[PDB]
């Protein structure tokens, strides 16, 4: 019986070359595709910019065009999904989780174009949703697709490629190779049984997809907070308290995102039109705020450096927060195509900055800089809600480049997972996949 | 599927009692490593103060240098050969076994044997790293608490034993991330599913690190400063680097294994010839620890100096061959002690030299020798022990040059890829296989 182990250990890490060479392909394709989806959404916000320039005069007219364009780009995506692939609604992450369990269909002929264009619409519109959702789900279908098109057979290639696809799509979405690899092994893979996924392949894919996003997007970061200060040992307790705050609120937030999916479905009863309409209404309210309080709308990445340098009054932060809990729900709960990572980074960075601000004057002797509690709280919803700390910590670390905060960060993070488990929260990904798998067998 | 729904709704709900124990494994592995480390220091320290007393006559000081190194060597070689022969070598594969339930976690014997066994070999200035000691110790500190509280069932028995190993890897490099990563990447049961709580591994890895911090802060183990960056058109050079490492990774495995055989013949298993040859080997180090201070030691001292490029091109080749020699001798003679630390030193030097050749074959590239150092540093860690992920997150936390993350990943995956195709094997799982096979032999 052990006799077997000896035979396996002499065999370990010898993934069949053909599965490796195909990871390098899925990579380059998921890579380029993100860059596309990316340059796309940009142009679209940019056009909506140039179009507010033309109506420079007349104020209510401005608000109107700001509302309408976004409503119009919204719908186009709401429709595109409710019509040709209703699986590309929402993040699209748990759908790839399901697919690795073989419980969901990897319908890539439907999803590749629906998600790509569906997102370009919602994002280009400036709704509160992140590139990840789109780029990860797209990445998986880029995998499945090159798998089928080369008729590679057997459990391993069908898992490996499907996994190196999702990974490459998350690395390209935050310029974050490590956060990628880590995302699969911590969060994507089957959480309860053994699976046959080549780690050395996920790596080849996550490199190729990053060299693509490098080739095109180099010499500017998505987040630049510069080199912040350090954390003296007698400071640490404060990030544990930060971590408790995040951890009690993480599940309250999950209870909200789920309840809103239901409370939102009531308003259209599943009807492809009431839906695409409510969608234009929500994406419309965004393009408005995209221009009246440009902090309350958008992906988040823009307000991260501003909140971290501390340049917001204490009220402003509370306002941005409540206002963003409202805008982030509406967008993700209405099941428009688009991830929920990005807006959770933004959400945490704010609650982090505010906690740090209070701490900054409650302890002058500590020589605090509200900024550090920003960079602690940035990955903290990523841990109390999605419940996947390790991933989010390697993430925050690769974007903010502040390795000297690694201790406070882990604490805030672990604080949060711990407190969310004892206040009965669940992994927000696996909770959705569960409603979906359970609502599938709920038609017998 | 019916079941999947049920479990998704249940995931990440590790039993409180398992968490609270990870917390204590942690703190204990933590403090322990600090001890082992403050220990080794003191010992090399005394051997210096004793070289100052003999400041005049030369061959006298050569002798004293050979002598107490040989003396601290045997002390450890004996200590292991008598009271716990599993604490010889790295000690890492033994814990992998243990997690597979295939070796025994004999903590009553190992804790003290490894601890004092190491202080001996390392204090002496042999070419072995602190992890070996500190990881194995960590696991035993895990097992133990688990016994002492009679926590029952497969989960606690794996979880604690894993959080233990992690926390001692962390404290060994000040590297929390590398730690958790080491478990999921290389330590866990590679072929069957296991029930290890990752949320606990974290708690231990934190508490371990806070102990190490409380005592060891305000100085890094490696300080290379903020090095330059990597222009896109320079990446192919780190692929070439990764292929050199990947062909040589397996050659080095074959030498470590073969040397364990070619050294076993010198004593036949004989508790005395062994302890004797050990004093010889460890004596050789204490000599070179003072005649070519680069040839001897853990490595952490020459990583800075090679990366600033301050070595002539010959000196590098010299240091390198001289190291493949001293590294083997020490690790293959089954002295207690890790092989990570000296593979870092090895890679860093091969890296620096590749970099140096690159620096003048490409004046247009505006190269810094330095950066191929910091890509090569974790390269053996992936060509040999063949676990890149862990070794990359490692070099990252030590050298803090996140802007080299691309060349580093490439030189790394380059190596794993090229070892796999010139038929190399994970040097850990290779060792545990010799052992588990030599058991029912």
């Amino acid at each position, epitope marked *: 019986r052990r006799r077997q182990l000896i035979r396996q250990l002499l065999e370990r890490d010898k993934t069949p070359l053909a599965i490796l060479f195909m990871a390098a392909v899925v990579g380059t394709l998921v890579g380029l595709a993100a860059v596309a989806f990316d340059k796309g959404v940009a142009w679209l916000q940019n056009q909506r910019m140039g179009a507010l320039v033309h109506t420079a005069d007349n104020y209510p007219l401005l608000l109107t065009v700001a509302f309408l364009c976004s409503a119009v780009l919204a719908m186009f995506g709401y429709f595109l999904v409710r019509k040709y692939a209703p699986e590309a609604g929402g993040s699209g992450i748990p759908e790839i989780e399901g697919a690795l369990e073989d419980q969901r269909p990897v319908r890539w002929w439907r999803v590749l174009p629906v998600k790509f264009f569906g997102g370009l619409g919602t994002l280009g519109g400036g709704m509160v949703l992140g590139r990840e959702g789109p780029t990860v789900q797209i990445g998986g279908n880029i995998g499945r697709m090159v798998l089928d098109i080369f008729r590679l057979k057997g459990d391993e290639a069908r898992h490996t490629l499907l996994a190196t696809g999702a990974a490459a799509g998350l690395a390209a979405a935050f310029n974050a190779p490590l956060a990628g690899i880590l995302f699969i092994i911590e969060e994507m893979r089957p959480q309860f049984r053994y699976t046959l996924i080549s780690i050395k392949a996920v790596f080849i894919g996550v490199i190729m997809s990053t060299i693509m996003y490098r080739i095109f997007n180099h010499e500017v970061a998505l987040i630049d907070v510069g080199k912040l*200060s350090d954390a*003296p*040992l*007698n*400071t640490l307790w404060l990030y544990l308290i930060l971590g408790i705050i995040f951890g009690i609120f993480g599940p309250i937030f999950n209870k909200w995102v789920l309840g809103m999916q239901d409370l939102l479905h009531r308003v259209h009863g599943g009807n492809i039109t009431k839906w695409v309409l409510m969608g234009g209404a929500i994406g419309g309210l965004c393009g408005l705020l995209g221009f009246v309080a440009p902090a309350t709308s958008g992906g988040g990445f823009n307000l991260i450096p501003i909140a971290t340098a*501390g340049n917001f009054s204490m009220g402003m932060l509370v306002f941005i927060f409540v206002a963003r809990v409202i805008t982030t729900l509406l967008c993700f709960s209405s099941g428009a195509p688009g991830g929920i990572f990005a807006p959770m980074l933004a959400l945490g960075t704010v609650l982090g900055t505010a906690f740090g601000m209070v701490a*900054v004057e409650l302890f*002058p*002797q*500590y*020589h605090l*800089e509200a900024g550090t509690f920003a960079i602690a709280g940035m990955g903290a919803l990523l841990a109390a809600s999605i419940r996947a700390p390790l991933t989010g910590i390697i993430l925050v670390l690769e974007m903010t480049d502040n390795y000297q905060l690694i201790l406070p960060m882990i604490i805030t993070g672990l604080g949060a997972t711990l407190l969310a488990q004892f206040t009965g929260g669940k992994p927000l990904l696996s909770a959705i996949l569960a409603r979906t798998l359970a609502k599938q067998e709920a038609e017998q | 599927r019916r079941q999947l729904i049920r479990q998704l709704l249940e995931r990440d709900k590790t039993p409180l009692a398992i968490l609270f124990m990870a917390a204590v494994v942690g703190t204990l592995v933590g403090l322990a490593a600090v001890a082992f480390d403050k220990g080794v220091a003191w010992l090399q320290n005394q051997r210096m103060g004793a070289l100052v007393h003999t400041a005049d006559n030369y061959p006298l000081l050569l002798t004293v240098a050979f002598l107490c190194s040989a003396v601290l060597a045997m002390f450890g070689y004996f200590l292991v050969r008598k009271y716990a022969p599993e604490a010889g070598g790295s000690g890492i594969p033994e814990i992998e076994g243990a997690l597979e339930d295939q070796r025994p976690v004999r903590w009553w014997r190992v804790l003290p044997v490894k601890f004092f066994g190491g202080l001996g070999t390392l204090g002496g200035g042999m070419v072995l790293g602190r992890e070996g000691p500190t990881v194995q110790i960590g696991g035993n500190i895990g097992r133990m608490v688990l016994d002492i509280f009679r926590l029952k069932g497969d989960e606690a028995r794996h979880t604690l034993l894993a959080t233990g190993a992690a926390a001692g890897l962390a404290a060994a490099f000040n590297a929390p991330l590398a730690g958790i990563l080491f478990i999921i990447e290389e330590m866990r049961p590679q072929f069957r599913y296991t029930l290890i709580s990752i949320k606990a591994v974290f708690i231990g890895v934190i508490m371990s690190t806070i102990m190490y911090r409380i005592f060891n*802060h*305000e100085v890094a183990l490696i300080d290379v400063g903020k090095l330059s960056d990597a222009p896109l058109n320079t990446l192919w050079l780190y692929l070439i680097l990764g292929i050199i490492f990947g062909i040589f990774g397996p050659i080095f495995n074959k030498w470590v294994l073969g040397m364990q055989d070619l050294l076993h013949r010198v004593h036949g298993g004989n508790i005395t010839k062994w302890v004797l040859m050990g004093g010889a080997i460890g004596g050789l180090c204490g000599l070179l620890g003072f005649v070519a201070p680069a040839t001897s030691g853990g490595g952490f001292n020459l990583i800075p100096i090679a990366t600033a490029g301050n070595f002539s091109m010959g000196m590098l080749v010299f240091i390198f061959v001289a190291r493949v020699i001293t590294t083997l001798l020490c690790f293959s003679s089954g002295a207690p002690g890790g092989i990570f630390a000296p593979m870092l030193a090895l890679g860093t030097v091969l890296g620096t030299a590749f970099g140096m050749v690159a620096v003048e074959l490409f004046p247009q590239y505006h190269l810094e020798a330095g950066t191929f150092a910091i890509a090569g540093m974790g390269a053996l860690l992936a060509a040999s022990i063949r676990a890149p992920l862990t070794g990359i997150i490692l070099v990252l936390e030590m050298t803090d040059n996140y802007q080299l993350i691309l060349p580093m990943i490439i030189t790394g995956l380059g190596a794993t890829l090229l070892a796999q195709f010139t038929g190399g094997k994970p040097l850990l799982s290779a060792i545990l296989a010799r052992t588990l096979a030599k058991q029912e032999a």
Partner: antibody
Amino acid sequence: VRLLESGGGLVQPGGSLKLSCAASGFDYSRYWMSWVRQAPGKGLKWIGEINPVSSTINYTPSLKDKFIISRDNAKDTLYLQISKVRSEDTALYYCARLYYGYGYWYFDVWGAGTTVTVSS
Amino acid sequence: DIVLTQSPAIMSAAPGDKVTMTCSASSSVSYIHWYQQKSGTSPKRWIYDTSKLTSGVPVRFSGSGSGTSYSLTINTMEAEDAATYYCQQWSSHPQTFGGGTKLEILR
């Protein structure tokens, strides 16, 4: 590292002066800087401290606008302006780089001082 | 504001002697620091974090304590150990200093 504070001397009572402290040999940012004074024979009492980018500036419980600390990051200098000088301000003035171990902060490296005489 | 009170305002001891001054806080404080000032010289940091020795400082030095009462100790005092020693604390803002303790060589 060296901290060289200049610009002391003889002030008339009621007038004011601008002490300057010039610092070489260490990365002048990353660090908080802080002024402290000593009335000839008598305690050390702390004037105030400034962070690296001038966003936090704390002073000792003292009259509304008695002291203006500032720092010029590029010229590597720390200033201190004292205004309406009465004679209790007659003391020797030292600058100092702040650090910590566990993070209960200490005064890391002091300079020579300069003397301020307040008299008519 | 926390007031530290020094032990012997002034005191003399023969060269070779166990010497002990005392910081006596008005309330609680933790991890105090010690500074050394020779005549017309600028203060040096001597002991930090109640007992860690500023790298450089002779090993004969060693302070400690806690709660409300701390103390610096020379173990066999010397020539060069004539100075003034100030305890400083920053456990609570704003931070503060002692009356000083004047250590004069006895002969």
